[PDB]
Amino acid sequence: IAAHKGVNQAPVPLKMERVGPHDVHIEMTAQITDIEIDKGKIYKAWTFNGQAPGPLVVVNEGDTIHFTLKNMDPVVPHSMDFHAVHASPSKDFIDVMPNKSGTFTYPANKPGVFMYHCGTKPVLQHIANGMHGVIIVKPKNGYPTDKEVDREYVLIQNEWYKYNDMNDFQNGVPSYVVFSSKALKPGDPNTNGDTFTLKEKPLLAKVGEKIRLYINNVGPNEVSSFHVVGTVFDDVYLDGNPNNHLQGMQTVMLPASGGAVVEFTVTRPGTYPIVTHQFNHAQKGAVAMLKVTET
Amino acid sequence: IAAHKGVNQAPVPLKMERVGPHDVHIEMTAQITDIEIDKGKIYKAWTFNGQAPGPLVVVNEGDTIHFTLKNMDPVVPHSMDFHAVHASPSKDFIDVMPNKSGTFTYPANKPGVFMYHCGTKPVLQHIANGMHGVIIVKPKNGYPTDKEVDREYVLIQNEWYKYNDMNDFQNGVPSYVVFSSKALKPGDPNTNGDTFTLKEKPLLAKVGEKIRLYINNVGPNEVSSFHVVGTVFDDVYLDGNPNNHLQGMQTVMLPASGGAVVEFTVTRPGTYPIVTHQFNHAQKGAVAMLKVTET
Amino acid sequence: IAAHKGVNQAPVPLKMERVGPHDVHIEMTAQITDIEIDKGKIYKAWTFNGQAPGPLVVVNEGDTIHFTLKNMDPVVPHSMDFHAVHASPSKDFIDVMPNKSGTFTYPANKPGVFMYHCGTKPVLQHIANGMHGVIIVKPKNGYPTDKEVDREYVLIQNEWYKYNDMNDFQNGVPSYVVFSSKALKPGDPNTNGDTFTLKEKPLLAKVGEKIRLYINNVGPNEVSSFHVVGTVFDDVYLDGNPNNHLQGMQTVMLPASGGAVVEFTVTRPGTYPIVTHQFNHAQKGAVAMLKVTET
Ligand SMILES: [Cu+2]
Ligand SMILES: [Cu+2]
Ligand SMILES: [Cu+2]
Ligand SMILES: [Cu+2]
Ligand SMILES: [Cu+2]
Ligand SMILES: [Cu+2]
Ligand SMILES: [Cu+2]
Ligand SMILES: [Cu+2]
Ligand SMILES: [Cu+2]
Ligand SMILES: [Cu+2]
Ligand SMILES: [Cu+2]
Ligand SMILES: [Cu+2]
Ligand SMILES: [Cu+2]
Ligand SMILES: [Cu+2]
Ligand SMILES: [Cu+2]
Ligand SMILES: [Cu+2]
Ligand SMILES: [Cu+2]
Ligand SMILES: [Cu+2]
Ligand SMILES: [Cu+2]
Ligand SMILES: [Cu+2]
Ligand SMILES: [Cu+2]
Ligand SMILES: [Cu+2]
Ligand SMILES: [Cu+2]
Ligand SMILES: [Cu+2]
Ligand SMILES: [Cu+2]
Ligand SMILES: [Cu+2]
Ligand SMILES: [Cu+2]
């Protein structure tokens, strides 16, 4: 895109604030940002806030979101679709023009680990170019296993294709499949979907801990066979809804846009790979590491 | 196929009648019918009754089906496999020759949303060319959420490939992925698997309604990540069996041949896309619309 | 691989023995063995024990496994990852050099139907070349439906690609997708993943029986839509964990590495195909048969 040549918009922090017991303001950008998706490979991503996947959003069950999108893209319209919410797509997930802002309000009444993404046609193009993310809605009554959890992280799986190539997006295999982590607490890593960062800078944990991962596979196109090497999931909640409770899974199948909360124990010191078990995708980037130490 | 050149057999209505408290007659055709699968694109489909997917069948749990296939195809044998039933495949899902009929009887003792299809080798060829459909078996005791449902429709996802091309069927990506709707009550739409009809003529509903969809992904080859934009599934029953109850799903993964009953609330007026969230497939046709109005 | 030219190591039996109430020794080989994967097609597989998938392992919930791998491969290192166990991957699933042995100990505390495989980088290469299998962990308290089961077998789904071709492994469609069966009791068949053996020599059962299948789809890359023609699954336990209980499924979606215990009744004499319902994969080999007789 001629108006994107040379564009590299610095990442802008997510802006959130609570404005009532059940009401939260969120402000995001749509912006054009170079991201190194594999060593030596820059993708001029279409993004929320200069991250791909975008920044993590966390709300409480029952919160109404008053969402603003500020479109920094000089030429392409963008929009926002939160899978968490009940909304009229043709009124509430509509386009914001270049250099404009739009505000939309809708309720998050369901707990879970939801995808968000740009909803502008062609949606495949906007997703594939980077405009995806996760919103977590915390359940009012928690999860039954909350008390057993020692540590938690968020992981997101995505694919990358040939740059802005719709033929490839629709017909081709992914060039890369990747994990990213988005921070829940200070100190947590916050990374973009790339083939290497979570190998070089593993997630951390201690021996004996029960680890919770909030996970979502945002696609655009593939399903995920999510697995932690050297463990078994003690408990899984599909889509992060507490009622959708499975036990003792080795591998959790996630549809495109599918989420889960998974929990597992790391019993020994060492480094534990985290994969999609579709190993063509793992080979093409989708392996993260978890480094478990006596500390 | 030389004997299919110029063949375009007019659609024939499904014939059903109840013949006892637990016994139902069904008569279908196998026939060769031109269907416009995308604008300007005619596929000379292999079909049940001149529809692809075929006509909807609905029975009650515990019904024995006395099924007749009348094969109108001038040269290819065809057969019928109902996933609802318990049957001997090598006696009961056998071939009917051109210009002949066959009658087979078997019981539907399980509730749910089942695929049916032609079972003639190579099965991939017969499925891919159009010979798939849905049979709904209504549970004797209903679903626990029946009383909350305001309106219902049936949707079916399928793919289309390069015409009668086995190499493509086995090795290629789909050319189109599509939704169709099949009528449960008078007035409901009844459409074929195409890229456009359910965009141009959305399904209808009113503001505030809880909508039930009976869905099946008949393939032949892909899995589906079924999602309604602007809502969350309140309740999902996998395969339509009442016991397989999930809550609060954003997206339901369906295997090839997989079914579900899903229920969701539309809270605001507007048009709500219905997709598979594998967006390469959505781009290639698999988006239907639901138009929600104050009436 | 130059050092694999002309290598065809005769299959070696799995060695197992119990050494305490909760402790079991297992000894396997890594070895290079020609397997006929389709008629006329030899694949010089990388294997455990000269089988691909490898030999079946069955332990009890709560058993600690003291596992030895004897690497017979003249030039490539190999390793073992059991999805059943809790282990440190970087200490316990490490490489064994050519012509060496390694011993690793870890506990199987979760019931189910778990994949095992070689864990040597690149893992895709080692899996794709044949180094996969199943370990069954029997639940201490059984399954609630145990008393209804008349007969049982183990099936495994895998793919085969172009020989040792990483480009194909990562980017190409499978050349074959296959089922194998691994023996639970004397007399049961024990076969390799090929396109034909379970067609020519169907699994056997009697009319009226309830059949349990322990199934795993080891991939490397595809998901499976597992279905038995002419029946419906009465009961399904995802990953073989008794708590993950579904009823009345027509088709069970399995992720890559995903397992299940499925149970179904065969009501009439005849031959019942067993498929993945992704029919491109079925066409490419993944159909087994079950022959049901009055005896
Ligand atoms: Cu309040
Ligand atoms: Cu506000
Ligand atoms: Cu956009
Ligand atoms: Cu979406
Ligand atoms: Cu792919
Ligand atoms: Cu702890
Ligand atoms: Cu593992
Ligand atoms: Cu574990
Ligand atoms: Cu539970
Ligand atoms: Cu009666
Ligand atoms: Cu009759
Ligand atoms: Cu046919
Ligand atoms: Cu079928
Ligand atoms: Cu495909
Ligand atoms: Cu209502
Ligand atoms: Cu949505
Ligand atoms: Cu909803
Ligand atoms: Cu329930
Ligand atoms: Cu004991
Ligand atoms: Cu020992
Ligand atoms: Cu190996
Ligand atoms: Cu594994
Ligand atoms: Cu494939
Ligand atoms: Cu019996
Ligand atoms: Cu069937
Ligand atoms: Cu059955
Ligand atoms: Cu149950």
DSSP assignment of C85-108, as one string?
S---HHHHS--B-TT-EEEEEEEE
- The two tokens of residue C147 are 């008393």
User: How far apart are alpha carbons C270 and C294 in whole angstroms?
Assistant: 9
- The two tokens of residue A25 are 């303001």
**Residue pair B35/B43 in contact by the 8 Å Cβ criterion:** yes
Residues 6+ apart with CB under 8 A from B25: B15, B16, B17, B18, B19, B65, B66, B67, B68
Give strand pairing partners of A65. A24, A106
Give strand pairing partners of A44. A34
Nearest to B221 by CA among A172, C217, C282: C282
Which of C168, C277, C281 would best serve as a mutation to test chain B binding (most B beta carbons within 10 A)? C277
Chain B neighbors (3+ CB pairs < 8 Å): A, C
**Residue pair A214/A239 in contact by the 8 Å Cβ criterion:** no
For B124, the enclosing helix (H) or strand (E) is helix B123-128
User: How far apart are alpha carbons A215 and A180 in whole angstroms?
Assistant: 10
- The two tokens of residue C44 are 């010089």
DSSP state of C9: P
Half-sphere exposure of C105 (CA within 13 A, CB side): 9
Nearest to C121 by CA among C89, C143, C74, C148: C89
**Residue pair A224/A258 in contact by the 8 Å Cβ criterion:** yes
Half-sphere exposure of A216 (CA within 13 A, CB side): 30
What is the separation of C-alpha C258 from the centre of its chain, rounded to a whole number of angstroms? 10
Residue of A nearest to B226 (CA): A255
Nearest to A214 by CA among A281, A163, A146: A146
Q: Do B89 and C249 touch (CB under 8 A)?
A: no
**Residue pair A230/C86 in contact by the 8 Å Cβ criterion:** yes
Q: How far apart are the first and last CA of chain A?
A: 50
**Residue pair B286/B178 in contact by the 8 Å Cβ criterion:** yes
A7 interfacial to chain B (CB closer than 8 Å): no
Annotated binding residue at A132?
no
User: How far apart are alpha carbons C37 and C192 in whole angstroms?
Assistant: 8
Experimental method: X-ray
**Residue pair A258/A226 in contact by the 8 Å Cβ criterion:** no
Annotated binding residue at A209?
yes
Cis peptide bond prior to B107, omega within 30° of 0: no
**What's the Cα-to-Cα distance from A187 to each of A113, A145, A195, rounded to whole Å?**
21, 24, 22
Nearest to A254 by CA among A111, A128, A115: A115
Give the CA-trace dihedral at C70, C26, C12, C181, to 10 degrees: -130
User: How far apart are alpha carbons A162 and A48 in whole angstroms?
Assistant: 20
CB atoms within 10 A of CB A1: 13
Residues 6+ apart with CB under 8 A from A119: A79, A80, A81, A89, A93, A126, B229
Q: How far is A240 from chain B (nearest CA, A)?
A: 9
Which of A141, A238, A244, A252 would best serve as a mutation to test chain B binding (most B beta carbons within 10 A)? A238
Residue C181 belongs to a domain with what CATH number?
2.60.40.420
**Residue pair B30/B126 in contact by the 8 Å Cβ criterion:** no
User: How far apart are alpha carbons A47 and A32 in whole angstroms?
Assistant: 6
Q: What is the pairing mode between strands B112-117 and B132-138?
A: antiparallel
Helices (H) and strands (E) in chain A, counts: 5, 20
Resolution of this PDB entry, in A?
1.2
User: How far apart are alpha carbons C154 and C180 in whole angstroms?
Assistant: 8
**What's the Cα-to-Cα distance from B91 to each of B67, B86, B104, C58, rounded to whole Å?**
13, 12, 9, 36
A60 interfacial to chain C (CB closer than 8 Å): no
Count of structural domains within chain A: 1
Give the CA-trace dihedral at C275, C280, C281, C285, to 10 degrees: 80
What is the separation of C-alpha A102 from the centre of its chain, rounded to a whole number of angstroms? 23
Rounded to 5 degrees, what are φ and ψ at B90?
-80, -5
DSSP state of C27: E
Rounded to 5 degrees, what are φ and ψ at C279?
-70, -15
Annotated binding residue at A83?
yes
Output the 3-class SS for A144-159.
CCHHHCCEEEEEEEEE
A204 interfacial to chain B (CB closer than 8 Å): no
What are the b/e assignments for C179-199, b being 16+ CB within 10 Å?
Answer: bbbbebeeebbebbbbbbbbe
Which of A263, A277, A284, A290 would best serve as a mutation to test chain C binding (most C beta carbons within 10 A)? A277
Q: Do B248 and A253 touch (CB under 8 A)?
A: no
What is the separation of C-alpha B232 from the centre of its chain, rounded to a whole number of angstroms? 23
Radius of gyration, alpha carbons of chain B: 18
CB atoms within 10 A of CB A284: 23
**Residue pair B188/B203 in contact by the 8 Å Cβ criterion:** no
**Residue pair C123/C226 in contact by the 8 Å Cβ criterion:** no
Nearest to B78 by CA among B22, B42, B50, B117: B117
Out of B81, B114, B238, the one facing C229 most closely (by C-beta) is: B81
Q: What is the pairing mode between strands C287-293 and C23-38?
A: unpaired
Q: Do C248 and B255 touch (CB under 8 A)?
A: no
Q: How far apart are the first and last CA of chain C?
A: 50
A124 interfacial to chain B (CB closer than 8 Å): yes
B292 interfacial to chain A (CB closer than 8 Å): yes
Which residues of chain C have a CB within 8 Å of the CB of A230? 81, 85-89, 92-93
**Residue pair B61/B95 in contact by the 8 Å Cβ criterion:** no
Out of B253, B265, B269, the one facing A255 most closely (by C-beta) is: B253
* Residue-range definition of the domain harbouring residue A247: 1-295
DSSP H stretches of helix in chain A: 89-92, 123-128, 166-171, 197-200, 279-283
User: How far apart are alpha carbons B29 and A250 in whole angstroms?
Assistant: 45
A208 interfacial to chain C (CB closer than 8 Å): no
Out of A247, A271, A277, the one facing C219 most closely (by C-beta) is: A277
Half-sphere exposure of A40 (CA within 13 A, CB side): 0
Q: Do B268 and A87 touch (CB under 8 A)?
A: yes
